[PDB]
Amino acid sequence: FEERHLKFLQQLGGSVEMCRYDPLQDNTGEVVAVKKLQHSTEEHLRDFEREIEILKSLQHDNIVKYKGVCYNLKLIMEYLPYGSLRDYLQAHAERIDHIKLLQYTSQICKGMEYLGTKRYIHRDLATRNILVENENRVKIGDFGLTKVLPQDKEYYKVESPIFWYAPESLTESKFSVASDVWSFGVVLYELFTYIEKSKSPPAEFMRMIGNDKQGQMIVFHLIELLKNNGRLPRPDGCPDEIYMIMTECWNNNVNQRPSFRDLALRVDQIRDQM
Numbered sequence: 594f595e596e597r598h599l600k601f602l603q604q605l606g607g608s609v610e611m612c613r614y615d616p617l618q619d620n621t622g623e624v625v626a627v628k629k630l631q632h633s634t635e636e637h638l639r640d641f642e643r644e645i646e647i648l649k650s651l652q653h654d655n656i657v658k659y660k661g662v663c664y665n666l667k668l669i670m671e672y673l674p675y676g677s678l679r680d681y682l683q684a685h686a687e688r689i690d691h692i693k694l695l696q697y698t699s700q701i702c703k704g705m706e707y708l709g710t711k712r713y714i715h716r717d718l719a720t721r722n723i724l725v726e727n728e729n730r731v732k733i734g735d736f737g738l739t740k741v742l743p744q745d746k747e748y749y750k751v752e753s754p755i756f757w758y759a760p761e762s763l764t765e766s767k768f769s770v771a772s773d774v775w776s777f778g779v780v781l782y783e784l785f786t787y788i789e790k791s792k793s794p795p796a797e798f799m800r801m802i803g804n805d806k807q808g809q810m811i812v813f814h815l816i817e818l819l820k821n822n823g824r825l826p827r828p829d830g831c832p833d834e835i836y837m838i839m840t841e842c843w844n845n846n847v848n849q850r851p852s853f854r855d856l857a858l859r860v861d862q863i864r865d866q867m
């Protein structure tokens with residue numbers, strides 16, 4: 594990929610831009626998503642190459658396709674036109690029923706189950722990091738915080754998304770498949786809230802902790818709440834069997850948390866019985 598053939602179309606949200614890769618200047622070229630670093634440091638760059646290597650190594654239906662690179666390093670990916678699942682849910686909620694939410698849920702599990710075989714830990718599972726390809730397919734769209742497990746350990750030690758974090762991630766900075774399972778439970782909760790603003794994991798947890806709590810105190814109070822089995826409530830209209838999956842993902846006992854395999858099967862069964 595050559596920088597002079599990447600035509601700027603728009604800012605998507607380092608930074609992510611929508612470009613046209615048109616080498617033979619005529620607009621026939623394909624529209625791609627381009628990720629680049631804003632405040633490019635030696636440390637920020639070294640993790641970005643690991644992210645590029647992680648994406649290149651991934652070949653799955655529910656994982657955003659790697660296309661190539663561009664050198665001032667730029668990661669070139671396929672363009673998914675409906676944006677993040679977080680935005681798509683807010684926008685088209687009217688055409689999204691519980692069967693559709695479970696179809697998305699299932700796809701997220703399948704993509705996560707695949708990451709697991711590569712011994713990769715996502716660390717940032719949230720609806721904002723899930724992209725919509727079309728009305729029937731979603732993909733994990735960002736791998737910026739993804740880590741590779743040490744060959745001999747089942748975990749890894751590292752601004753963080755605290756309201757999606759497992760207790761051991763908050764207390765010990767320990768990231769594993771089980772902490773990705775914990776976050777999947779938050780993703781499932783987000784889906785069944787349909788991203789109703791007041792019902793988001795930060796909004797709910799803050800109410801439970803006290804909206805008076807500030808900065809450094811919030812984390813300790815969140816750690817305490819989770820330890821005293823305080824949990825996100827059941828979203829309105831959320832089927833009890835779906836809430837039981839969430840609560841099982843939110844087990845304080847890391848080893849008692851379900852596998853992405855079992856989760857996809859359970860979600861697929863509920864979906865069929867619906």
Ligand SMILES: Cc1csc2c(Nc3cn(C)cn3)nc(N[C@@H](C)c3ncc(F)cn3)nc12
Nearest residue numbers: 605606609626671672673674676722723734735
């Ligand atoms: C409004 C909108 C419409 S399409 C789209 C999009 N598409 C995209 C991003 N990538 C990496 C591939 N296609 N990415 C983004 N934003 C970027 C930051 C993005 N990248 C990855 C992700 F998981 C979620 N969002 N917004 C939109």
